[PDB]
Each structure stands twice: as structure tokens, then as C-alpha cells.
Design a protein around this ligand. Structure first.
Ligand SMILES: Nc1ncnc2c1ncn2[C@@H]1O[C@H](COP(=O)(O)OP(=O)(O)OP(=O)(O)O)[C@@H](O)[C@H]1O
Ligand SMILES: [Mg+2]
Lengths: 128, 493, 44, 468, 466
């Protein structure tokens, strides 16, 4: 999951030059910088609140697969927190499934790919 | 037991073997021998076992190995009294003006602890420098430490000399310590003091650049010992006992360089900027002795005016910040203002005097507070000064007023102004009586105006002088008289 | 307007170059002082 | 006992004692010095067959080799207890005020004591209201914790310290201790005397609840080196009995610089820029005694002088790790006539925690830092290209940042001497409300010049209305 | 005397002497070299029982420990008198030119003298009239005062030096001393020899009116350190006779560097950026004998090389602490054939104040710099849009500024044979009047030409009429 995260963050750092000055950038670069800001705001973790491996994997999958594009930046952290509460209350089995097969060579198993994108979509309807 | 022999002469230090019964800072004698008629003294500092390192107060090539040394039994001391008045002397107290030998009843030991915390009182009596800007925005009182810090040729020595000159009828014993200054600049200062007749109350201690690093290190301490003697015992000036002294240490940066040379030649570990680790202690123990004693301890004072030379207007160096921390207030002399023609160049925006504001005549502060406000407005609106025709009436009026005040502050050298003249001119300028005067002649106007009060209305000047201690200086009588004076002068001109 | 803006920016850049040159020279002198101090300490 | 001085190198005196009567490491020896007054040195090193190196803590410029030294057998003992309240002492515990000497019945405690153990440490702390906007907002002054201001020469460390003492010294709820290590005797003391004796708490002056140990710039290195320890010994007695203590040490740096001079005279191998090799250990030994324990609390406020303007100097760098709250004063801010001169981005505090200081206070402080961080990120672009090149929101953030910089300025009651602005005391709630309103957008129309030397936001609004 | 070498470490040697008769500091001990030639070492430290540490000032490669050492009992004895004129010497006083030895009849004085006492110093500062218009107006000299010149030596610095020597020779007592401290053997010795022997004035060559002391590059650091003191010793004889002397010290920074190298060799602790701890004291031993006394005056022009480009570096800082005027030769001013390529804006002087040079001199000099400063500001704009955008009056200041900077040129008597143009000595009062009358409006109709390489305004008009 984190390869896309690293690539997009590096590329956003690269386009920060155009972000500081240029306002005539095309829609592709605007969405690109917006995704970079999404990913940066995802990492603004608080103190004494560690996230287990399954939780981080779920959040990074949600962010990297464009499920978080509609959320404005200042709420993303809150979004993430709320999302986790959802998985801690609505569906613990998806977290258990993610943790159980985190060592397989191809993580996005069709079983894993479903019931997680479904969980993300269910959370999207419930909140905003 | 009181006589020793030199066993090594090196980097300005003689090892003085076998000189028992020497205290930690005697002044050893080096009695004269063949080829050296006079005696050069030395300060024993490293009283280590079976050898006594001693700084050689003078040229070190004069003495040899095996030279006899005689302990004088005295901690390093400088002669002091009334005989020092009007004499240019070495840091050792020996005269160099050639007028004659110094007559002194007693000698004061330099390198002494300051009076202390309890034996002090807040400054109350002002010191009139004679500069409009200094006496208005940077008040100086007796017994405070105010620093003159500037970039090379910017007028630090000129400001100090003007302050010394102004203290003619103020009952001050001005002391000028030239540390590391070239002999030409010391001679010119002495000549300037002689021409204006200020040497009747001025003691000059000279430690020139050519002299050994032993001197330029004890010169400020000798001057401060003289100032302490003035502060405690007092002397007879103009028939009255004065116990207030003003000391100008001149370049303490050269003093710091001399002490750095002394320390490095003694193989002491270097610190920041290769200065010894105790250079702050040097300047603090030098300046802390300048105090304003309370009534029970004499009531005397010793005002100190150290001078610091910076490089490229860098006030963040080691020695400048050390002296800034030690001193009470700072007089930043910018080089840009000096080159722009504002010869009394003061960075009034960031120059300040933490103490001495209360030690100002009530009239001077009464007329200078709103002067400071208007100058602050000018500094703020200097950003908007670039635009033309885009400024309303208020901003343009403020800009013109600030330019007028700055031109007023521009004062020629060697022309001290009495306090009454200063307050009168400030009153006239800061109460909208000079708005019609064009800027380029305001300074000229000031001179003419002073001449007016020097001829037409001496009684106005006397009345202003007598009414400077009152809580409310703008009393109806003095206000009406002064307003009539400016109205009469403007009509004639 | 672009010509005036670039003239102002060039003047500002020259002033910043002067300030940075002063700072760099101060740092260079400090570095030389530190090097000679530590070399003399190691020798002694 | 009854040794003889061998060498006198500066303020370091080497003395030879009998083989079986060598003084201990921290014992105090005495030179009779004649005249009925004696010089008290403190041993520092033992060099061999009865030879000990000590620090004079005095003039030590009129005594010769071969003078006898008497070994007291105990370290420096200073009086402790209520007898020391309202009195001014040396490093040696000898009063310098006009009142008489402390009686023999008063307990004498050594100035060298072990710091509180790990068990005794009290980690509970809460916000201490000080009335200064920048201090109470960015780097809250900590009750029962260690805080300090790091300022250059020209900045107003003394003004800030005096304002803090004036604000918090009337409502002490306990005694206080002020140590004047390496500070001017003009303002650092003898005018704090005037202000402390003038202040009255229900017919008892603040000076009547204060133990002041001095050892200022004029004293030799030993006095400046051990005056802090003497003050700590006088304050530890009051902490141990439960009384809350406000501790104000001045220029902890000057404490370190003296140690440096003492070490240089002692022949130790120099480290970094001429400093002593034992810098960290000396700082620890002094600072770990400044701790609130389970028996009592010490609310300590310190000052630190940065040489030149170098915050990377070993002394401030060593101090930085011994504090709960850090307040950095910068010359660049001071030269902008911002007399508080505190840099919000370089000032931190441990209690700036939403559980401790409040959620609204925490959010306001974090936003006031994120702004001015956006400003520091754009300083060069504004410097070269100018304001126009920034985006609209960037322009808004820069304008708000400069308004915030002006608004952090605040007149002080002790600054009336050279500034005509009357002093202002802004409570922490008013500061938080003012900055929250400023960040929301209220006051955007107000010119920046109206935020200079003001109290809360209501004063700025009133000034704007007066200007119409 | 009659010591023996105890230690040879590079140039720094040590000599053991009897318990008595130990040489003092700066005592110039002499080692026979097995022939007529000798090695003169200057004692810098006294160590222990008779051992003295000295600086070689020579090859010190053929020496062996145990060799005989003779104490001279005095510092380096330098010959002084009229015999030194027209001759070239090294630091030790030995003539390095083709001519033979000076001779025992000529007086020899110690190298290490003392600066004139406080009484002998002049109370007031008197302006030294060099005669060059730009030098005497923008950055006027001070009689008995130090002066610095900044240049890359390709801008006619030697021409200015020769002009100053010729002017003082023909209109004053006129003796000069040139101290080549750190002077290259090819560029700075033979080239200057040919220039000074070829340059002639009133049937006398410049070389005949000057005393040249060369501490060359190849000499050890002690020689380059003490060559300046040798030059001062030589010039002090002429100063004591009441004459006025010009002392030209080339690259005083090389004197500073030699002092630093000597201090490093002696083992002394380093200070700041690789500088000697005795930097201020060494700069005070020099440049303090350069004063205007009652009997006579020594005015010195000293080339100063600025390390990197630091005017805050300790060596240029200590030099500046002793300077009364700075002359900044600049390359562009010399690329255009203005040989007196003194940059008026960069060059300053302390004596340029109303109380010394007069109110009229101060007023015209400031206005000259003011219009030039305005021209420098408009140098960008003229290249920006052309002279057309400039407003009127500003267009006059540009037109006037070009004319005045062309008028800063002046024919030189030492360059008469090269350029075929007689030299013009313009007095300070004449210079002030000419430039004031140029500024007030006279000569505005005259084009930029006819001001080039002229003398007073009178010359500019007479030429315009013809
Ligand atoms: N108010 C003034 N009006 C006119 N000229 C002034 C004024 N103040 C100073 N000057 C001149 O400025 C020059 C430098 O001043 P000054 O002699 O005080 O030197 P400085 O800045 O103290 O330092 P330094 O000793 O390094 O030259 C002198 O020529 C002096 O006459
Ligand atoms: Mg000066």
C-alpha cells in the first residue's frame, strides 16, 4: 500500500514549487497537489494514540484508492479518527481479516478487497 | 627576601625567580641599571612555586635575564588626588604631558571590588551632554553606565568629548581614558580640551597603540580608580567639593584586544572569538565600580561612558554584547546616518537608556516625550514616504514634522548647548512654532534663535534654568515669556 | 509594470546578497578561529 | 588543619596541609588575612601529598605565598529558616544588609547537597497566570516547574523578569528566593529592593517574604559560581517544610561562565569555546536541586544570557534540556520595538497541553504558531519578490501574522521609566479570547499599527474607534 | 657575547650564552657563515639560563648546532643619511643594488626606535597638498597621517607613487622612502627600478630622490616583518632634519602576514582567523612612528590587500584603525583612459571636514560626490530605457557628472615623456575653485572633451577658446 503513498508524497513535495507561486496550473496538477495535501494531513497523528498495523493499512488503502478525495483537508484527520471508530464498532471482522492475512504476497485479495471498500463506502454514506 | 632575579623574559612576561613575600598583585619595580635610567614596573600575577610570573608594564626588551627586581609591597595602585587634575598621565600615574611631576597625597589600588548592591541608590541627577538628541531621547544621569557603540569613524569620540566639554559648570571631574588610541588622536583630543578650557576639570589617562599590551589593560582601571577617589573623597573644583565624576573609557574593544593579547601570550585557553574566557569579568569589574552611592556612603557618583567599535554595524559580536549587557543604556551611532549628513548620528529607534529617564530635568522630559512620539511617527511613516501625492494631509504633515525634528537634532561638533537652550528650542519646535520654517535652514535658525536668547532675553534663559526642577515646567509665566520670545524672534527674522 | 517589479526584485536580491556575504564572512572567520583554537589545544 | 599557601594563580589557591589532615573535596578553608576578616576558599581538587586546589571566592589579590590556611572541616554552611526571610546574603551566607548578623541558634546547612532522588520528583504541574500575553499564550509559565528566558544582550530580560516579579510576587501564597548571580547591582538589585520593599501584601511587604542572595558581576568567579548553590540551599529548607517557593535565578549563564573561569584557572583541559570540561555535570548539580518534590513545590523562573547572539553556545544548549518552559528572546524582534521580544516559534512549554491548559487555549496557541510559521516560510519571497506574488490566502495569513507579531507586544508597569505607555495586565482568558478573535477575522480591517503596545483585543478596538 | 647555537628548527633558532652578557630582546645576533657573509638573527625571546630564541632572517640551511654566535648589543643597525638616497637596501641595511658598500663613516641607527612622545605630536591636523586634483579634493591627504590605496596594480598605482614623489621633491624638501614589504623580485623590484630611473623631474630622476628598502618574497618571515621598521628607521633621519617625507609601503597586509608567520613559528597561541596575538601591538609599533611632529612629518601611503573581500577581517581592521584616508583605484575608471583612476565614491578621508580643509572645500567635495552618486544610481536606468526617460536637471547631473569624472584626469610630470603632455600641479585652493565653478554652471556649454587630462578650469576654458 505505501508505495503509492511515498510516490505521491515525493511528487507533491516536487510540485510545492508551483504550489507556492503558480495559480494557473492545470486541473491535473491541482488534483495532484490536493492528493498530496490529503496524504500529508493523513499523517498528522496525535500523541499517545498509536494505530495498529491493520488500522494504518485500512486508512492508507482508503486514501490511496481515491475514497478520500471528496473530504476537505481540515477534516481528514477527524475523518480518519471517525473511520476507525466505525471499524471498531460496525465491523471488527474487517480489521481481523486485514490483520490475519497481512503477510500474503498479494495483499489486495478479492476477499480483502471486498468488505473493506464496502466498509469505506458504508462509512461515506453514514458520515456526510 | 624582598628582592628577586629575572630568570626568563618572554612574551611580555618575566618569571622573577625568588621573590618571596610578594602579594598576588604587587607592582614590582625592576630598579634601574646601566642603560635604563628610569624604572619600569610589573604586575606579579602567577605566584606559583619558586617562580613569580609578572606582566611587564612597558617594553619588554628593556630588561634582561638576571635583572634585579624589588618588591614595592603595594598592590598595583595609581596615584590619585587633586594633583591629577589637568594632567595627561600614563596608566601607571606617571605624567606624559611634560608639565611636571604629579603631586599626590595618596595612591588608590586599582582592581578593587565594586561598592556593592546595598551601597547604591537610583540615579536622580541628570548629566547634560549638550547634544539635543542625547539629552532628549537618551537621558543620562550621574552614576549610570551608558555605552557609546558605533562603527569606526562615526563620532563616538566626538560625542564623548562634547559631553566632557559641556560639564564645565556642572561640577564634574571628567576622566578620559584613551585605550589603544594612536598618539595623534590623543594629542588632538588633549588640544581640543585645552582650547575650550575643559582641562581644568579633566584627567586624561593615555595608553596608546604603540605601548605594551600590559598598558591598555590597566589604563581603564587606573582611570576608574581616579573616578572612585572623586566619587568617595571628592576634590575641590571652582571652590566647591565635587564628588561626581564622569569617565569615558573610549574604545573598550581595543582594551579587550589588549587583554586578549596578554592572555594568549600567557598561554591561557582561548574562548569565543579567541578572547579569554574572563573578558566579560574584565569589563564587568571595570564598569561595575561606576556607581551612584547612597547618602550614607557619601552620595557621590561616577558616570561611565564606554565606547565600543563594531565592524559593519554588527552589534551581535562578543565584546559589544558583553558591554551592552554590562551597561545600563546604549547609544547606537549608525554609519548610514553619519554619511547622510546627520552628524550626531543616533539610531533613536533602537537606542535606549534603561535608567536615567527619571534622572532627567522635568522640563527636558516634558518637552521631549512628545518629541519622541513624533520621531516614532516619522520612523513609522518612513515606509510611506516613498509615495508621492498618495498621502493625505496627516501623513504628509507628520513626515514634514519628523524631517524638521531630525534637522533640528543635527548639531555641529564642539558646540554644546545649555539645558535651558535645549528645552526652549524643543518647546518651540514641538509646539508647532516651526512649521512655517523651511527644513534646510532650521539648524541655522536654531543658532540664530540661541543668539537671540543670548542677547535679547537673558532673563528668559535664566527663568527657564531656575524653573527646570518644578513638577510642571510649563508654568504660565515661563510659557508666556517663552512664547513671546519665539513670536518676537520670528517677526524680526 | 513587469520591468519595474523586476528592477525592485533585483535591487532586493542585491541587498540580500550583501547581507548574506556579511554573514558568510562572519561564519568564515568564526570557522577559522575555531579550527586554529582546536588545533592549538590539540598541540598543547 | 593549619596548611600553608604554595601558589596563588588567579582566584585559585593551592595549599599544602599535613599528610593526615588533608581537607575533603568540598570543604571550606580560610585565610586569616589579618584585619580580623578572613578569606573563605572552597576546595575543588586534591593533587597529592596534602596539596589541595581551592577557589578563593574573594579578592585574593593582596595575599602572599606561605600564608597559613585553616581547615574548617565542613563545606560552606549558610543560614536557613525564617531568620533568612527578608534579608540579603552573600555567597557565604553572611548578610550584607544593614541589619545584624544571623544568630548562632539559626540552623546552618551546607551549600552542597544531593538533589532530590527519583522517588521525590513531583511531575504534577498547572498553568501559572503571569499577565503577559506571549508568555501566557505561547509558552505558559509553569507552576511547580522549571522555566527560563534565553535572551541576548540588548533584549529585555531584566524588564521581563521585573514585570514577572511585580505581577506574581504579591499573590505568592508562600515565600520567595531571588539569586543575583552575575547581574548588574544597579538594576538587577538595589532597585528590585526598591520595588519589592514598596509592594505591600496586607501590611507585609513582598521583601518580607523574600530571601535574596546576590554575588553579582563585581564579585570574583567563586562567588558567582557558588551563589546559586547558596540560594538553592536557602530555598530547599522552605520547600522541605511545605511552603511554596517562587525562585528567581538571574543569568544562570553567568553561573556557567564563572565555572569556566574557575576551570581555566584550575588547569583543566578546555572544552568547546574555552568552557569547562565539567559543564554538563555542574549544570546538572545546580539544576536538579531546582525541583518541586512531594513535600513542597518550587516555581522556578530563570534567565539565561546567550553570548553574542549564539543560541548554539554550550551554556544555553545545556540549559535547554533542564526546563519545562522555554521563552526565547530575539534581538531582531527587539530591534522592531517589540519590547517583549519573545519569538513564538522558538518558545515552547510542556504544559501547553489541552488537558492541562484547556482545549481552546491549546487550539489558539497552535494556530498562532501555524500562522507565523507560514510567515517564516514566506520571509524571503516577501523580501525579494514582494507581497503581490503570494496567493490570496497566503496574503491573508501574512497580514494576520504581522498583526499577531505587533499584538504580542505589551507595555509593562516596570517600563514606565523609559516608555510612556502605562502598564497592562492581560489575563490568560483575555489573551486567548483576543487571539481567537484575531484569527477568526475580526480586526482584519484594523491597521497593524493599532496592535502595537496594547492589552486585549478590546483595547485595540477602542483605539481604532478613537482613530475612527 | 660569543654564544653557541643550541637549536635550529627551521628559521627559529636558539643560542646559548654565558650567564652574563645575554642579549636583550630584538638584539640582532650574528652568525658567521664561514666567509665574509653572515646571518643576522633577531632575538625574540629569552629562555632559562642564557638561551635566547631568535628568528633567522636568512637561509639557515648551512648552519650546525654549536656554531659561534656574536651579540651586537643593539637592534638591527640600519645605515641612515643622504648616502641611502638613490640606493636599494634589504631589511638588514645591506645595499642589494650594483653599487658597493655604504661605508663605516655613515651613521647606523637601531631598527627598533620609539614613536615620538606625546609632547612632540602636533595638536592640529594639517592638510598635505599632493597636487593631484581628485586626491586633494575627494580624499585629501593628512600631513603625517597614514593613507591607504586599493588597487590591482594594473591601474597606474606606480604612476601615482612617482607623481607624489616628484611633487614633494620639487615643491617641498622632498625625500621619499619606498618599503617593498613582501615585494616580488621581478614585478616589484626590477620593474619599479626601471620606472623610477627612467622617470625624471627637473633633470633629476625619481630614483635619485627616494630610498628603496626591499623585503622580498624569498626572504624569511622575520625579514618581511622588519623591513617596514628598516624603512621607518631610514626615513626618521630625514624627518629629524625637519624635512617632510613620503613613505610608500606596498601591501601592508604582507607585513601582517609576516608577523603572523613569525608568531606561529615562535609557538605563540593563534588569535581569531590565523592572526598573531600581538596584532594590535605590532601594528602600533609600526604606523605610530608615522606622525607629524614639531620638527618634521612623515606621511605614508600604504597599499592594503584585503583578504578575500573582508573589510572586517582583523588585518584590514587593524590597518583601518590607523588610517586617515583611503584611495580606491578601480579597474573600470582606468579602462577608460583616466589614469588617476581614483574612485571618488569609494575613496574617503578623515580630514575632509569643514574645521580643517575649510567650509568651501567641504561644500564642493560633497556636491561633487552627490552628483556622482546620483549618476551611479542612474547608471542602471540609462541602460534600462536610455537617457531620454531621465528627467531634466537629472539629465544635467548625468551630463555634468560625466564631465566632472573626465575632469578628474590630470597630466603628470612623471608621465610627460610617455604621453608627451606636460604635468600640471593643481593646488588645493585652485582645485576647489575650479570644481565649484564647474558645478555652479560655468563650462556647461563646453562638451565632455577639453576637460580630459587638464589642469584648472582656466585650462579648460583657454582650450575651448583655442
Ligand atoms: N557632530 C559632528 N559634526 C561634524 N563633524 C563631526 C561630528 N562628529 C564627528 N565629526 C567628525 O567625524 C570624524 C570622526 O569622528 P571622531 O573623531 O569622533 O571618531 P569616532 O567615530 O569616535 O572614531 P575613530 O576614533 O575610530 O576615528 C572627525 O573628523 C570628526 O571631526
Ligand atoms: Mg573615535
Amino acid at each position: 500500500v505505501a508505495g503509492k503513498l511515498k510516490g505521491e508524497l515525493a511528487q507533491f513535495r516536487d510540485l510545492a514549487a508551483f504550489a507556492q507561486f503558480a495559480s494557473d496550473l492545470d486541473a491535473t496538477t491541482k488534483a495532484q497537489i490536493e492528493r498530496g495535501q490529503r496524504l500529508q494531513e493523513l499523517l498528522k497523528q496525535p500523541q499517545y494514540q498509536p494505530l495498529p498495523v491493520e488500522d494504518q493499512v485500512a486508512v492508507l488503502y482508503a486514501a490511496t484508492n481515491n475514497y478520500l478525495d471528496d473530504v476537505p483537508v481540515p477534516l481528514i484527520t477527524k475523518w480518519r479518527d471517525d473511520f476507525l471508530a466505525f471499524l471498531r464498532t460496525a465491523h471488527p471482522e474487517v480489521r481481523k481479516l486485514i490483520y490475519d492475512n497481512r503477510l500474503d504476497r498479494k495483499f489486495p485479495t478479492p476477499e480483502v478487497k471486498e468488505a473493506l471498500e464496502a466498509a469505506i463506502k458504508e462509512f461515506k454514506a453514514t458520515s456526510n | 627576601v624582598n628582592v628577586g632575579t629575572v630568570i626568563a623574559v618572554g612574551d611580555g612576561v618575566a618569571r622573577l625567580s625568588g621573590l618571596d613575600q610578594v602579594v598576588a598583585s604587587e607592582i614590582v619595580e625592576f630598579p634601574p641599571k646601566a642603560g635604563r635610567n628610569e624604572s619600569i614596573y610589573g604586575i606579579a600575577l602567577n605566584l606559583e612555586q619558586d617562580s613569580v610570573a609578572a606582566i611587564i608594564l612597558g617594553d619588554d626588551e628593556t630588561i634582561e635575564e638576571g635583572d634585579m627586581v624589588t618588591s614595592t609591597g603595594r598592590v598595583i595602585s595609581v596615584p590619585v588626588g587633586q594633583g591629577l587634575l589637568g594632567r595627561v598621565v600614563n596608566p601607571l600615574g606617571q605624567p606624559i604631558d611634560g608639565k611636571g611631576p604629579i603631586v599626590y597625597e595618596k595612591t588608590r589600588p586599582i582592581e578593587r571590588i565594586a561598592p556593592g548592591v546595598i551601597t547604591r541608590k537610583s540615579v536622580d541627577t541628570p548629566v547634560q551632554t549638550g547634544i539635543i538628541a542625547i539629552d532628549a531621547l537618551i537621558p543620562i544621569g550621574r552614576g549610570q553606565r551608558e555605552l557609546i557603540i558605533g562603527d569606526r569613524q562615526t563620532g563616538k569620540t566626538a560625542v564623548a568629548i562634547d559631553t566632557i566639554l559641556n560639564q564645565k559648570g556642572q561640577g564634574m571631574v571628567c576622566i578620559y581614558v584613551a585605550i589603544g588610541q594612536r598618539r595623534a588622536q590623543v594629542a588632538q583630543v588633549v588640544g581640543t580640551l585645552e582650547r575650550f578650557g575643559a582641562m581644568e576639570y579633566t584627567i586624561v589617562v593615555s595608553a596608546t597603540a604603540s605601548e605594551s599590551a600590559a598598558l591598555q589593560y590597566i589604563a581603564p582601571y587606573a582611570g576608574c580608580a581616579m573616578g572612585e577617589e572623586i566619587m568617595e573623597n571628592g576634590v575641590m573644583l571652582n571652590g566647591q567639593l565635587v564628588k561626581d565624576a564622569l569617565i569615558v573609557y573610549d574604545d573598550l574593544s581595543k582594551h579587550a584586544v589588549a587583554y586578549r593579547q596578554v592572555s594568549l601570550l600567557l598561554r591561557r585557553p582561548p574562548g569565543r572569538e579567541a578572547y579569554p574566557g574572563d573578558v566579560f569579568y574584565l569589563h564587568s569589574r571595570l564598569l561595575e565600580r561606576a556607581a551612584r552611592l547612597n547618602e550614607e556612603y557619601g552620595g557621590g557618583s561616577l558616570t561611565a561612558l564606554p565606547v565600543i567599535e563594531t565592524q559593519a554595524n554588527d552589534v551581535s559580536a562578543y565584546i559589544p554584547t558583553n558591554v551592552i549587557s554590562i551597561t545600563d543604556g546604549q547609544i547606537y551611532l549608525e554609519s548610514d546616518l553619519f554619511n547622510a549628513g546627520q552628524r550626531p548620528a543616533l539610531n533613536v529607534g533602537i537606542s535606549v537608556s534603561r535608567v536615567g529617564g527619571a534622572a532627567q530635568t522635568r522640563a527636558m522630559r516634558a518637552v521631549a516625550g512628545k518629541l519622541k512620539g513624533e520621531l516614532a511617527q516619522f520612523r513609522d511613516l518612513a515606509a510611506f514616504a516613498q509615495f508621492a501625492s498618495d498621502l493625505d494631509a496627516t501623513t504628509k504633515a507628520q513626515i514634514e514634522r519628523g524631517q524638521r525634528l531630525q534637522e533640528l537634532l543635527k548639531q555641529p561638533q564642539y558646540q554644546p548647548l545649555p539645558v535651558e537652550d535645549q528645552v526652549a528650542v524643543l518647546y518651540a519646535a514641538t509646539n508647532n512654532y516651526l512649521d512655517d520654517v523651511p527644513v534646510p535652514l532650521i539648524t541655522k535658525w536654531r543658532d540664530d534663535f540661541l543668539a537671540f536668547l543670548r542677547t535679547a532675553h537673558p532673563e528668559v534663559r535664566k527663568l527657564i534654568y531656575d524653573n527646570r526642577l518644578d513638577r510642571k515646567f510649563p508654568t504660565p509665566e515661563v510659557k508666556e515669556a517663552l512664547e513671546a520670545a519665539i513670536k518676537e524672534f520670528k517677526a524680526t527674522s | 509594470a513587469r520591468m519595474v517589479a523586476m528592477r525592485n526584485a533585483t535591487n532586493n536580491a542585491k541587498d540580500l546578497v550583501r547581507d548574506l556575504t556579511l554573514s558568510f564572512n562572519k561564519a568564515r572567520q568564526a570557522a577559522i578561529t575555531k579550527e586554529v583554537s582546536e588545533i592549538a589545544s590539540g598541540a598543547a | 588543619a593549619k596548611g600553608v599557601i604554595q601558589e596563588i594563580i588567579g582566584v585559585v589557591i593551592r595549599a599544602k596541609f599535613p599528610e593526615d589532615e588533608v581537607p575533603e573535596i568540598y570543604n571550606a578553608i580560610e585565610i586569616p588575612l589579618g584585619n580580623g576578616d578572613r578569606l573563605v576558599c572552597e576546595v575543588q581538587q586534591q593533587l597529592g601529598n596534602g596539596v589541595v586546589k581551592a577557589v578563593a571566592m574573594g579578592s585574593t589579590d593582596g595575599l602572599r605565598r606561605g600564608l597559613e590556611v585553616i581547615d574548617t572541616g565542613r563545606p560552606i554552611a549558610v543560614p536557613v529558616g525564617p531568620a533568612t526571610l527578608g534579608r540579603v546574603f552573600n555567597v557565604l551566607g553572611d548578610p550584607i544588609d544593614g541589619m545584624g548578623p544571623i544568630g548562632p541558634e539559626v540552623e546552618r546547612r551546607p551549600i552542597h547537597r544531593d538533589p532530590p532522588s527519583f522517588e521525590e520528583q513531583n511531575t504534577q504541574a498547572q498553568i501559572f497566570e503571569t499577565g503577559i500575553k506571549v508568555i501566557d499564550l505561547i509558552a505558559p509559565f509553569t507552576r511547580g516547574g522549571k522555566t527560563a528566558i534565553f535572551g541576548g544582550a540588548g533584549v529585555g530580560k531584566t524588564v521581563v523578569i521585573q514585570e514577572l516579579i511585580a505581577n506574581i510576587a504579591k499573590e505568592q501564597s508562600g515565600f520567595s528566593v531571588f539569586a543575583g548571580v552575575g547581574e548588574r547591582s544597579r538594576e538587577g538589585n538595589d532597585l528590585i529592593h526598591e520595588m519589592k520593599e514598596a509592594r505591600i501584601d496586607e501590611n507585609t511587604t513582598v521583601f518580607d517574604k523574600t530571601v535574596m542572595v546576590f554575588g553579582q558581576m563585581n564579585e570574583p568567579p567563586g562567588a558567582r559560581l557558588r551563589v546559586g548553590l547558596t540560594a538553592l540551599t536557602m530555598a530547599e529548607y522552605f520547600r522541605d517544610e511545605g511552603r511554596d517557593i517562587l525562585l528567581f535565578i538571574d543569568n544562570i549563564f553567568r553561573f556557567v561562565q564563572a565555572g569556566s573561569e574557575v576551570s581555566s584557572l584550575l588547569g583543566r583541559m578546555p572544552s568547546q569555546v574555552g568552557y569547562q570540561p565539567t559543564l554538563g555535570t555542574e549544570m546538572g548539580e545546580l539544576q536538579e536541586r531546582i525541583t518541586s518534590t512531594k513535600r513542597g513545590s518550587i516555581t522556578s523562573m530563570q534567565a539565561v544570557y546567550v553570548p553574542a547572539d549564539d543560541y548554539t553556545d554550550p551554556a544555553p544548549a545545556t540549559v535547554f534540556s533542564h526546563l519545562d518552559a522555554t521563552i526565547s528572546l530575539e534581538r531582531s524582534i527587539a530591534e522592531r520595538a517589540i519590547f517583549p521580544a519573545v519569538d513564538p516559534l522558538a518558545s515552547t512549554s510542556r504544559i501547553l497541553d489541552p488537558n492541562i491548559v484547556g482545549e481552546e487555549h491549546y487550539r489558539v496557541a497552535q494556530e498562532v504558531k501555524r500562522v507565523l510559521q507560514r510567515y517564516k516560510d514566506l520571509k524571503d519571497i516577501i523580501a525579494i519578490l514582494g507581497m503581490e506574488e503570494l496567493s490570496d490566502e497566503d496574503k491573508l495569513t501574512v497580514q494576520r501574522a504581522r498583526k499577531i507579531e505587533l499584538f504580542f507586544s505589551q507595555p509593562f508597569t516596570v517600563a514606565q521609566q523609559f516608555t510612556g505607555r502605562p502598564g497592562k495586565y492581560v489575563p490568560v482568558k483575555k489573551t486567548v479570547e483576543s487571539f481567537a478573535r484575531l484569527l477568526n477575522g475580526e480586526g482584519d480591517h484594523i491597521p497593524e499599527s493599532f496592535f502595537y503596545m496594547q492589552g486585549d483585543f478590546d483595547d485595540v478596538l477602542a483605539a481604532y474607534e478613537a482613530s475612527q
